[PDB]
Nucleic acid binder design. Structure first.
Ligand SMILES: [Zn+2]
Length: 273
DNA sequence: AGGTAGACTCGGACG
DNA sequence: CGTCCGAGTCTACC
């Protein structure tokens, strides 16, 4: 999940948990709990707190409780559902928050890659992992100037640059590849090789792509669905991601896939330069 | 120095 | 039996 997927999960999850009070926290894979590292302390401190809100920062969910914030990263396969305490759990359920009304928030993650951090609210933004994040791409804090400031200082590939959450928060392999296609820039280009015009164009397409994907409920390409189990529809608007061997939608040249920044990377060798 | 490739956390779907 | 994976950290290598 990237920004659009996490944001869709946020909007669809909030009404199902807001105002509910935690009475138990059960943990079946402790490695997921990163702070406090002692999973018993993590569980104990949340008991008796009420969910007051749910925000997103980059690819993170931030649950706002009474004293604390719970910062959750889904990584590749993490997802949440709300269901009755009376029913058997689904496979791969690793953390469960039980509410006083007999409902439960369940965290499932087949690959076990996801993470959870709990801090007092006032500390959440000045500790890892949130402290080092770059600006929200749908905010005025993300501008061409912000992009250029980092790009001019490094010969790393532009793909490596955009995947770096300290540069700007929210883009991953799908939306990086798509943004670069739409801006007409090859993903292996050294960041410092980009012109001012290219940087402006890239910023414009990054904002448009990520905004469009939010409106369409994210991209369902393998396993992502919203909190109600509904697929997104942005996957029907992809130009390059997952389309290797198929004709480019704009020029008909077969889409290529190769390694860039050590990752599978999709591009049109004609539209991108 | 300042970069990339890819092993690793993990498990399952697909030739 | 090998390869792939909406993330991210880290090592090995150049
Ligand atoms: Zn093309």
């Amino acid at each position: 999940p990237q920004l659009p997927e996490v944001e869709t999960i946020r909007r669809t999850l909030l009404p199902l948990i807001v105002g509910k009070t935690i009475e138990d926290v059960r943990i079946f894979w402790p490695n997921i709990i990163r702070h406090p590292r002692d999973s018993e302390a993590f569980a104990a401190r949340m008991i008796g707190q009420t969910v007051r809100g749910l925000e997103r920062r980059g690819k993170f969910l931030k649950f706002l409780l009474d004293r604390d914030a719970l910062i959750s990263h889904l990584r590749m396969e993490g997802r949440y559902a709300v269901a009755s305490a009376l029913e058997p759990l689904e496979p791969h359920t690793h953390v469960v928050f039980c509410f006083t009304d007999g409902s439960e928030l369940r965290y499932r993650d087949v690959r076990k890659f996801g993470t959870m951090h709990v801090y007092a609210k006032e500390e959440a933004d000045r500790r890892p992992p949130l402290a080092e994040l770059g600006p929200e791409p749908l905010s005025p804090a993300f501008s061409p100037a912000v992009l250029a400031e980092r790009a001019v200082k490094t010969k790393r590939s532009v793909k490596a640059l955009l995947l770096d959450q300290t540069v700007v928060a929210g883009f991953g392999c799908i939306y990086v590849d798509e943004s670069l296609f739409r801006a007409g820039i090859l993903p292996g280009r050294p960041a410092a090789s980009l012109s001012s015009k290219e940087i402006e164009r890239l910023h414009e397409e990054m904002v448009a792509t990520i905004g469009e994907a939010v409106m369409k409920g994210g991209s369902t390409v393998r396993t992502y669905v919203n909190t109600q189990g509904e697929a997104g529809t942005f996957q029907h608007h992809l130009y390059v991601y997952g389309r290797q061997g198929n004709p480019c939608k704009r020029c008909g040249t077969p889409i290529e896939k190769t390694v860039v920044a050590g990752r599978g990377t999709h591009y049109c060798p004609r539209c991108q330069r």
